[PDB]
Design a protein around this ligand. Structure first.
Ligand code: NFF
Length: 256
């Protein structure tokens, strides 16, 4: 049984784990806590970049955005070394996905505009793709959570579907392919000849997420959503990337 392995991982890492791989032609859904809520964390940044991409002509990626000292409130490795010059929407997009740049995310939200610095327009974007589950706005807390199941179906639609026109779908896909942050999660649990694109998230209460699209060596695709937290260790509990790698390995197994 596959759920025994997963429960084993949860015991080992003293974690709660969430896994969802949506069904295909010959494969059934892989699901484990696939319907419980977990924080979004940085993972929202991927569909956030789709939101922006969808919303505008491609040449909008060339609009220059200025931001100051007070705009830099979270880990922002790219927004630090630009604050002077400014940054383009495309550069912010690049930074949001590939480096999980928090300031880049907050500026891209602000670009979407509307109430709540853009989080309503954002949620609106998710409703439009049939996601009634997620919500952007404390383990368990309703706010800024999604389910392994809801996010995986969102990513499926963005990377393998008609949510974005080929050209814009491509741009999203490329940024995730060249992610710098996911080396030790889903990537690590799949053989080197499977091609894996992903966006990660990480937070307090030992939260660690990875959402990905994978392609078998013969080009068959799957969406893989892995979400976890470790409330057992309190606010300052450490994220366990291993747990994510391991789960992926167990998922790599079934799909190989
Ligand atoms: C999005 O998850 C980012 N995470 C954090 O900035 C973050 C955090 O955010 C609340 C404002 C709270 C606690 C921690 C603890 C340790 C690292 C980061 C945070 C960025 N994304 C992460 C990712 O895995 O994609 C990251 C690159 C480690 S920071």
């Amino acid at each position: 049984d596959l759920a025994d392995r997963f429960a084993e991982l949860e015991r080992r890492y003293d974690a709660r784990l969430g896994v969802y791989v949506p069904a295909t032609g010959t494969t059934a859904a892989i699901e484990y806590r696939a319907d419980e809520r977990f924080a979004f964390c940085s993972t929202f940044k991927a569909p956030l970049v789709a939101a922006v991409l969808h919303q505008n002509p491609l040449t909008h990626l060339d609009k220059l955005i200025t931001y100051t000292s007070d705009d830099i409130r979270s880990i922002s490795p790219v927004a630090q070394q630009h604050v002077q010059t400014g940054m383009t929407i495309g550069q912010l997009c690049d930074a949001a996905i590939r480096y999980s740049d928090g300031t880049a995310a907050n500026l891209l939200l602000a670009d979407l505009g509307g109430p709540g610095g853009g989080t309503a327009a954002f949620t609106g974007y998710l409703r439009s793709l049939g996601d009634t589950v997620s919500r952007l706005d404390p383990p368990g807390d309703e706010r800024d959570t999604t389910t392994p199941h809801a996010i995986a179906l969102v990513l499926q639609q963005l990377v393998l579907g008609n949510a974005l026109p080929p050209d814009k779908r491509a741009l999203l896909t490329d940024w995730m392919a060249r992610n710098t942050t996911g080396a030790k999660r889903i990537r690590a649990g799949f053989p080197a000849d499977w091609k894996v694109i992903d966006k990660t998230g990480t937070g307090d209460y030992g939260r660690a997420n990875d959402i990905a699209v994978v392609w078998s060596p013969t080009g068959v695709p799957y969406v893989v959503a892995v979400m976890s937290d470790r409330a057992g260790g309190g606010y300052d509990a450490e994220p366990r990337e291993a747990l994510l790698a391991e789960a992926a390995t167990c998922v790599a197994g079934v799909l190989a």
